[PDB]
Amino acid sequence: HLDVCAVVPAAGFGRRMQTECPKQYLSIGNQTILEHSVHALLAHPRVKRVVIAISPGDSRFAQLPLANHPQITVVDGGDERADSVLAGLKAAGDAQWVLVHDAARPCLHQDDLARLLALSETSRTGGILAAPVRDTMKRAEPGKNAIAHTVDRNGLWHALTPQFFPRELLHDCLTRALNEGATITDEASALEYCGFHPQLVEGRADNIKVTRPEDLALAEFYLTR
Amino acid sequence: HLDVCAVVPAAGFGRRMQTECPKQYLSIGNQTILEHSVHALLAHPRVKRVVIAISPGDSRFAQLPLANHPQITVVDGGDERADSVLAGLKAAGDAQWVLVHDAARPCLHQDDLARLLALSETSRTGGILAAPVRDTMKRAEPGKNAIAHTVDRNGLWHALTPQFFPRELLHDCLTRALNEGATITDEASALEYCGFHPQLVEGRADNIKVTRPEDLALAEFYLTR
Ligand SMILES: Nc1ccn([C@@H]2O[C@H](COP(=O)(O)OP(=O)(O)OP(=O)(O)O)[C@@H](O)[C@H]2O)c(=O)n1
Ligand SMILES: Nc1ccn([C@@H]2O[C@H](COP(=O)(O)OP(=O)(O)OP(=O)(O)O)[C@@H](O)[C@H]2O)c(=O)n1
C-alpha cells in the first residue's frame, strides 16, 4: 500500500531561460537541475519508481546516470505539461499513489516531501505542497495596469510541487479535463475541474521553480553556499 | 514641481525575526537594513527629503549617520504602520508628491525607483511598484486547508514599495480610511477605499521585505555576493 511512483515532466525547452540548453539540464554544482529534483524524490523510502517524461529527440537524458538507474523509467512527453504527465502516468505500473514533481524545482526538502506523503494515510483525494501568500495582492483592472482592488490574501496559497494523488483518480481527472478542453495549470486543477478539493500541505517557500536566468543563481543559493 | 519627499515607516519591532534587535537595525555588510533602504531613496535626485518614523524610545536611530543628515527628519511613529505613515506625512513639508517605502525593503533598484517617479508626469492618482504573480494560486475553503478553487493569476500582482502618490491626496485617504475603520494594508489600499485606482508599475521581484530570519541572508544575496 505504501509504494509510490513519481512522475517528473521534463519534456519542456525552458524558452524563458535564454539558453539553447534545456534548463533542466543546466547544472548546479556538477549535477543537473533534473538530477537534483529526481534525487530528492528517491531519497524518501516510499518512492519505488520515477518515470521521467522527456521530449522526443532529447539526446541529453541518455548521457546522465539516471538513464541506467534501476528505479527510473523514461518515456516521451507531449506538447503540453499535462500531456507529459499523462504519458508518465501510463508507465507508473500498479502504484496506488503517484507523486508528480516538476523537473525544474531542485530545492525540495525531505521534511516537506515526507509531510506530503502522509496524505495517503488520511485522504482519499490527495493534495499538494503550497506556501501561504505573504505580500498584499492587487487585482488589475481588465486590460490596464491600474489597481481594481486588493485581493484578500487570507486563505490564498502559492501552488508548488510535488502534488500527490491516487494514481487512477489523477489519470481519470487529467483525461477528462483535457477531453473537455478545460484550462489546466497543475495536477490539482484537474482534480478541481472534476469536483474534488485536494489538500494544501504547507511547504517551504524556497522550493522554487527555475524559470528565468536569475533563478539559476537563486536555486544554487538555496541548495547551499 | 519635481521635488519629492519620502516617508519611511520604521517604528515596528520585527517580532517575526526572533531578534531582540529590531530588524531594520540588523546589518548587511556594515550598513543597517534601514540605511540600505534610505540610501536607495536618496540616490534619486528628486528625493529632497526623507522622513523616518521610529518608535518612541527607539535609542538606536540616534546612533546612525542618518541622524545628522541634512535631508533626513525623524518623527515618532504609531501603533500601526498607517499611523506611522501619517506621522511622517505630517512632516513632509510642502512636497507635492510623496514616496512611501518600507524600512525593511533594502534591495530597491534605481531603475524601478526612476520608473515609479515618472508617474508624476502622467498620473493624478499615483501608483506602486508591483511584481506579476508567477505561481498558480489556490484559494482555500473557509477555515480548512483544502483547495476551493484556483485563483486566476492573470492581472494579479504582488504589491511592493515604494508607493508614490500626491501628498495631500494620500494624507486625506489614509485619514478617511482610518476614521471609517477600514482594513488598511498598504498606502494604495487607502486610495482604493476612497474610490481611486492607483497605477501598477512593474518592478523587480528581488525587491523583498525582510520579515523572517531566513530573509536576512536572502537580502544579502540579492544586494550582491
Ligand atoms: N510539454 C511540456 C512542457 C513542460 N514540461 C515540464 O514542465 C515543468 C515545468 O513547466 P515550465 O517551467 O512552465 O515549462 P518549460 O517548457 O520547461 O519552460 P518555458 O515555458 O519557459 O518554455 C518542466 O519541468 C518542464 O520540462 C513538460 O514535461 N512537457
Ligand atoms: N506600527 C508600525 C508597524 C510597522 N512599521 C514599519 O512597517 C514596515 C514593514 O511592516 P512589517 O514588516 O509588517 O512590521 P514589523 O513590526 O517591522 O514586523 P512584525 O510584524 O514581525 O513585528 C517596517 O519597516 C516597520 O518598521 C511602522 O513604522 N510602524
Ligand SMILES: [Ca+2]
Ligand atoms: Ca531510495
Ligand SMILES: [Ca+2]
Ligand atoms: Ca541625493
Ligand SMILES: [Mg+2]
Ligand atoms: Mg512551459
Ligand SMILES: [Mg+2]
Ligand atoms: Mg508588522
